[PDB]
Each structure stands twice: as C-alpha cells, then as structure tokens.
C-alpha cells in the first residue's frame, strides 16, 4: 500500500516539476535573447563612437 501511494504522489509531483521547468526554460531563453541584444547594441555604439 505504501508503494501504491508513493507511486501516485511521485507521478503527481513529477508532472508539476516538468511543467514548471519547461516554462522556466522558455522564459530563460527569451531573457537570454534580450540580454545578448542589449550587449551587442551597446558594444556597437561604443565601437562606433
């Protein structure tokens, strides 16, 4: 019985952990894109000046 209950709560935990880490990965990818955009534009105006 302990095995059955641990199986249910493990599946229920792992689905939440999967969805949270997936959306966090999407948001971190977008932040990386904005980060390198700002870095290269400020580097470009520094180089040009």
């Amino acid at each position: 019985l302990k095995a059955q209950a641990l199986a249910i709560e493990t599946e229920a935990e792992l689905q939440r952990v999967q969805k949270v880490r997936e959306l966090e990965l999407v948001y971190a990818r977008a932040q990386l894109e904005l980060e390198v955009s700002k870095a290269q534009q400020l580097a470009e105006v520094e180089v040009k000046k």
Binding site: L1, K2, Q4, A5, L6, I8, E9, A12
Partner: protein, 50 residues
Amino acid sequence: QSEAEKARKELLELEALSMAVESTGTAKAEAESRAEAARIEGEGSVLQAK
C-alpha cells in the same frame, strides 16, 4: 506420595495445554487488531494521496 505424584503428572500435563491456549490467544488477538488497523490506514492513505 508416589501415587499422588502419578496423578499430579497428569494435572501438570493438562495445565500445560491450558497455559498454551491462554498465551496464544492474547498474542493472536493483540497482533491481529493492530494488523487490521494498519490495513485500514494503508488503504486510506492510498486514497488520500490520490
């Protein structure tokens, strides 16, 4: 005293069986009640986890 001991041997034989019954009953009851309560709690905890 020899004949009294010959009968007392048979009384001591019967008291052995009485003591065996009186001990195994208490052991079996106190074990099976806690086993049943543990079964109830386990079957509950499966549904609670669901």
